[PDB]
Ligand binder design. Structure first.
Ligand SMILES: CC(=O)N[C@@H]1[C@@H](O)[C@H](O)[C@@H](CO)O[C@H]1O
Ligand SMILES: *[C@@H]1O[C@H](CO)[C@@H](O)[C@H](O)[C@H]1NC(C)=O
Ligand SMILES: *[C@@H]1O[C@H](CO)[C@@H](O)[C@H](O)[C@H]1NC(C)=O
Ligand SMILES: *[C@@H]1O[C@H](CO)[C@@H](O)[C@H](O)[C@H]1NC(C)=O
Lengths: 48, 39, 49, 131, 48
């Protein structure tokens, strides 16, 4: 069940480091590289 | 020389795409594929 | 995997879900999503910020 | 029984018609389907459509021609380096930008990143040829 | 398992594309979705 709900794409992508998104600010669902668990802070609230 | 190995899974190939604010990729060719599915 | 899905969504639209990933500017994607719901895209470009 | 209801919905949507639900009738854009019978089971063949051979293009959302912003009707503006064209969203096919291909909406100072160009109507050469 | 199949359907339609089924992907006209991981589960954020 876990594999069939998550494993849906066959290349692992990454966002570019520049954030020129025209004004949108996805800073809360993007992963945070300052943590050992490279998770968004929303995931951190969910885990806490 | 055949034996049994253990490894960390590889999820998939890493692929970074050149995002910009003014660039669009448009396909030119196409393929018709047939896939099977069993229930 | 979650980070990969978010990357594909925010940079490629829905086009990566059926084939090879194509970049597209993000408010252009939002314009297509308004065109999906019967709103003409010029509503977006006047009111972006 | 749960699997049987799922297969019934698959036949009633993917086979007797065309569905727009992505990855319901196989991976890709769904075109059509065929069923075949197996001992205590069913086997679908989905015929799907997958594009390839993409290229790089420079784009712009709108065009300010005479102080008025033109928006493409169905498709997108592209530029290959020298000119501008209208194409549809899933096959590269350039056309000259016409009054038929765009429509006028508002003033060209509000939309961010407009690009100056020309818009060809067929009507001015039609009048000036007779003139 | 039944709930996981529902989750996989929601991930495949609400996230990877734009569904026209009303109130499948939250209240209102659906625009898009973002997934977030969770302990033993997933959390969708629907943008409508
Ligand atoms: C980007 C650009 O060149 N914009 C020009 C603007 O500078 C000029 O004042 C106007 C007058 O036609 O035409 C347009
Ligand atoms: C996104 O929002 C957070 C929350 O206030 C802020 O700290 C951050 O600077 C914002 N990012 C950008 C690029 O504006
Ligand atoms: C588009 O151009 C960039 C840099 O100019 C390049 O890295 C990229 O591979 C090009 N796209 C394709 C599909 O070749
Ligand atoms: C795209 O980003 C570049 C970054 O150098 C910026 O100069 C340009 O103004 C942006 N495009 C638009 C249409 O704003």
């Amino acid at each position: 069940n876990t594999q069939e709900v998550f494993a849906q794409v066959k290349q692992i992508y990454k966002t570019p480091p520049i954030k020129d998104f025209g004004g949108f600010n996805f800073s809360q669902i993007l992963p945070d590289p300052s943590k050992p668990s490279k998770r968004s802070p929303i995931e951190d609230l969910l885990f806490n | 020389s055949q034996s049994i190995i253990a490894y960390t899974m590889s999820l998939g190939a890493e692929n970074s795409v050149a995002y910009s604010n003014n660039s669009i990729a448009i396909p030119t060719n196409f393929t018709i594929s047939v896939t099977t599915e069993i229930l | 995997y979650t980070s990969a899905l978010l990357a594909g969504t925010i940079t490629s639209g829905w086009t990566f879900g059926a084939g090879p990933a194509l970049q597209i500017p993000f408010p252009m994607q939002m314009a297509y999503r308004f065109n999906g719901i019967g709103v003409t895209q010029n509503v977006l470009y006047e009111n972006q910020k | 029984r749960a699997s049987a209801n799922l297969a019934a919905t698959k036949m009633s949507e993917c086979v007797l018609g065309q569905s727009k639900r992505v990855d319901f009738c196989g991976k890709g854009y769904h075109l059509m389907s065929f069923p075949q019978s197996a001992p205590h089971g069913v086997v679908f063949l989905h015929v799907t459509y997958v594009p390839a051979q993409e290229k790089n293009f420079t784009t712009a959302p709108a065009i300010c021609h005479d102080g008025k912003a033109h928006f493409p009707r169905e498709g997108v503006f592209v530029s290959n380096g020298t000119h501008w064209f209208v194409t549809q969203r899933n096959f590269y096919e350039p056309q000259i930008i016409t009054t038929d291909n765009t429509f006028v909406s508002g003033n060209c100072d509000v939309v961010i990143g407009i690009v100056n160009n020309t818009v060809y109507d067929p009507l001015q050469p039609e009048l000036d040829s007779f003139k």
